[PDB]
Amino acid sequence: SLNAKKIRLENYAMKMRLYPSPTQAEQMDKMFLALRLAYNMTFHEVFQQNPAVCGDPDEDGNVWPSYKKMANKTWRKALIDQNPAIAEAPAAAITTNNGLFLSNGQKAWKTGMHNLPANKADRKDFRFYSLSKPRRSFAVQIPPDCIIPSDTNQKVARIKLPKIDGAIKARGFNRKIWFGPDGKHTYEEALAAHELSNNLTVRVSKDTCGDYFICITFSQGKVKGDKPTWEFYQEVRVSPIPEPIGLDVGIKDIAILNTGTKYENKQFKRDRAATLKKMSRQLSRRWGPANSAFRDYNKNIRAENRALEKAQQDPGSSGVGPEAPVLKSVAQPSRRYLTIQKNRAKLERKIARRRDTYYHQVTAEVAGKSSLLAVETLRVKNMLQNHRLAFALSDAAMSDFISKLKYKARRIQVPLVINAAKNILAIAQNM
DNA sequence: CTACTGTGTTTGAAAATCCCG
DNA sequence: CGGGATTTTCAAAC
RNA sequence: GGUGGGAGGUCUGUCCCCACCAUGGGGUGCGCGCACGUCCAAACGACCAUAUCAUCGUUGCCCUGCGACCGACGCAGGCAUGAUAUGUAACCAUGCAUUGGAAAGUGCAUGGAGCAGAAGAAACACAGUAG
Prior knowledge:
Layout: E1 4-8, E2 14-18, H1 22-45, H2 67-70, H3 73-82, H4 100-112, E3 138-142, E4 170-171, E5 177-179, H5 187-193, E6 200-204, E7 213-217, E8 232-237, E9 243-245, E10 255-256, E11 262-263, H6 273-284, H7 295-313, H8 335-367, E12 370-373, H9 390-395, H10 398-411, H11 419-430
Helix pairs in contact: 6-8, 8-10
The chain binds three DNA and RNA strands through β2, α4, β4, β6 and β7.
């Protein structure tokens, strides 16, 4: 009963939790920043139609940026020459197929800017990288020899990363996954038996709070015949005798089953709505940004800064020492702002994290019991017409639940399509 | 005015070049 | 001075 | 004993640890006490400490005196209410320097980190919404 049956994974991403050293964390942050500068400068230059970064002209004169050319060593060399602070990102994170230009920029231009020529396209529509949307990720390639799990502990890895010395300790090593021809090996067994891909992708990210993670993408190479290039398995639990289940959605519950069991969404927002709201108004009048009193203050300071620099540069001819230049800065938020900013970030990550874990648990207990899902809709726009659930949807996210159910019904290969729930299941059986 | 959410898209392999014991 | 680690190329374009 | 939280990848409880409030009052039993069970009260992203800022009667009072009207106005003072900044919170062990003749911390470098029950697909992009 409830046997841990192995499943063949099409892909994976071992989301773990790195514990870097202070200096190593600083280096990783510098790497994020260098990627940000690369993205900003390259896409700042693509709009001046620069053929050194843009592709070739057309029969009608149209030009798009070419991304096979941004993965050449020549433009990367030009970027390193322009500023050195960009030299710190790994070339595998910029030039390879999962890099800063062949993965981010490709989707960014192909969807955000609707795939239209770079001379007919605007600059205010493109969203650059800044504090609102920073670059908190990089995808480099390492061999399995840099993934050496801790011998004593069944949850501690030891990950070595490029340009990085120290072999990160990555807690949370998912040891529910087994490698080999039939998934009967540990990690060391497959590493020694040479059953692991020589170049595996890792994505170090830094979340809203200062917290560095990793996502190792165990992934089969090709689909030649019925045999993937590499194979690895995960063990999951299923009810001993599954039966068809028509899931139902209510007002005060997160999910209702046709059998009778119901899971209650404990409203993680409203219970902490008071503290979230008080912290929100708290930051609203602190020393930092998002204050409307010092945002305008620093915008002003920047305004007279550029005004005075213009007045001293050209009219003053900038000979040697004209007048007495004062530069100041855009000012920094004070720590008492940072402490409550981080506290609110921690609280809201904890709230969404409780939501995610609750949905994980509920989906796990509903996935095994159901051999055929009968959900109504995969989308939110097909249930907002009546607006009855909008009040519940304000604090409860149906999309996370729907996506989790959708992909977890695929691991068991379960096809996806109380009285009302039973009627829904009967209709699903009919069609 | 920041901060969170619904929806779509991805997810290497092998040489060639460089360099601290 | 040399195996291994870092970099580059694989490869087209609304 | 309850409330909020910090590390052990995530959730609950516990383990360790930090800041707080009840030692109360009430529906009914039995022998001044026992509550078999629920009820209300507190304490909510800290805590103090430091100096510097509310404003429309504000933050209300003390009304410490002062001036003037016929219960009400203004002037010079304080209280803790709130909010702006800084020294400042959350497991254990080792190694280096310092605080101390010690005890115990400080700053740095590491190392390790459950137990009980559940689960563990992440990154990017682009809209829109909440506050």
